[PDB]
Structures are given as structure tokens and as C-alpha cells.
Design a protein around this ligand. Structure first.
Ligand SMILES: [Mg+2]
Ligand SMILES: [Mg+2]
Length: 188
């Protein structure tokens, strides 16, 4: 019974694409079974359609609370026999409704070497701090924000004088390599 993965994403969907591409070339022993997107119009939705990956798209504005929409997401996840959840560019926190149902089965990729620079815009945080290096971390999601146990990490140097664009491209390249590799081992 191959594990079924749901990918949560809110934007361009480049990490989603990397995961789909890995599965397509036979390097991911899991089924990319669902895309959950909280931002209608996001490019990642078009990617799912092109890749024949089912998608559950919703707007938080149509619900009175996070619990309200996560309750529907949970029903959808269970009905589609989803085993694991991978956050890949999902721009909001996972609430107790999902954390409880998928405890220990939710992972996320974060653009810093956790516990360093947790939170939003971690690429910008490291750049603004002036540190000489940062990295990419895949970790388990728990009650805290970017605080669950580290699963894997890759160090990324920050070159003196280079624009932030240089660091971002480098970090994204690493994310596209690291996430599929980590998921392969986690779900294999
Ligand atoms: Mg090959
Ligand atoms: Mg509806």
C-alpha cells in the first residue's frame, strides 16, 4: 500500500512541481494524490490540473473560522485516503483540527537552518541579519510555529556583496532537490 500524499500550497507551486516531477520519473515511492490550495487563482492550481493531480481549492473568506475550513479539508483528506501532508509554500498555519488528525504525519519545508530564523520571510530575515550562511530545513509540523523536529537540512552560503536574488535562487534550487529526497525516504 503506497502512501498517499497531499501537498498544501498557496503560490507559484514550484515545490509542488518538484515533488510531482520526482514521482513521474520514478524517484518517489508515493502517490501525489491531492493539492490543497487556500488561494484561488494560484499558479499551483494550474500545475495540478496539467499533472492530473486532484485539487481541493477553497477561500478562507467563505468560512467563519480556520476550524470551519479545516473541518472540510479533513473530511476531504480522509475520504481520499490521504496518509501524509507536505506543506510546500502553504502560507498559513495548520490548526488543531488537522494537527490532531495527522499528528506526526505533517511535514513542511522552511528556507532557513532551523531553529534559526523561524517564521515568515526567513530568506529575507537571514539576508537582513547579515549572517554568512543559512539553509533549508524539512521538519515535522507540531503545535509550535516552525518548531517541530528537524528531519533534514542543507546549508546554503550567503555570498558577501551578492543581491538577495542570488540567495533566493540558490535556496529554491536546494528546496527542489531536498524535499523530494526527504519525502522519498519518509514515505518509502
Ligand atoms: Mg532515473
Ligand atoms: Mg463547497
Amino acid at each position: 500500500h503506497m502512501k498517499r500524499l497531499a501537498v498544501f500550497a498557496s503560490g507559484s507551486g514550484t515545490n509542488f512541481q518538484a515533488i510531482v516531477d520526482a514521482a513521474k520519473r520514478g524517484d518517489l515511492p508515493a502517490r501525489v494524490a491531492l493539492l490543497v490550495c487556500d488561494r484561488p487563482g494560484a499558479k499551483v492550481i494550474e500545475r495540478a490540473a496539467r499533472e492530473n493531480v486532484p485539487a481541493f481549492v477553497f477561500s478562507p473568506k467563505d468560512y467563519p473560522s480556520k476550524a470551519a475550513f479545516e473541518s472540510e479539508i479533513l473530511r476531504e483528506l480522509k475520504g481520499r485516503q490521504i496518509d501524509w501532508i507536505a506543506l510546500a509554500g502553504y502560507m498559513r498555519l495548520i490548526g488543531p483540527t488537522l494537527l490532531s488528525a495527522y499528528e506526526g504525519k505533517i511535514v513542511n519545508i522552511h528556507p532557513s537552518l532551523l531553529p534559526a530564523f523561524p517564521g515568515k520571510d526567513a530568506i529575507g530575515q537571514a539576508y537582513r541579519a547579515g549572517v554568512s550562511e543559512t539553509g533549508v530545513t524539512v521538519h515535522y509540523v507540531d503545535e509550535g510555529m516552525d518548531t517541530g523536529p528537524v528531519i533534514a537540512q542543507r546549508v546554503v552560503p550567503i555570498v558577501p556583496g551578492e543581491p538577495i536574488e542570488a540567495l533566493e535562487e540558490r535556496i529554491h534550487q536546494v528546496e527542489h532537490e531536498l524535499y523530494p529526497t526527504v519525502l522519498r525516504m519518509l514515505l518509502g
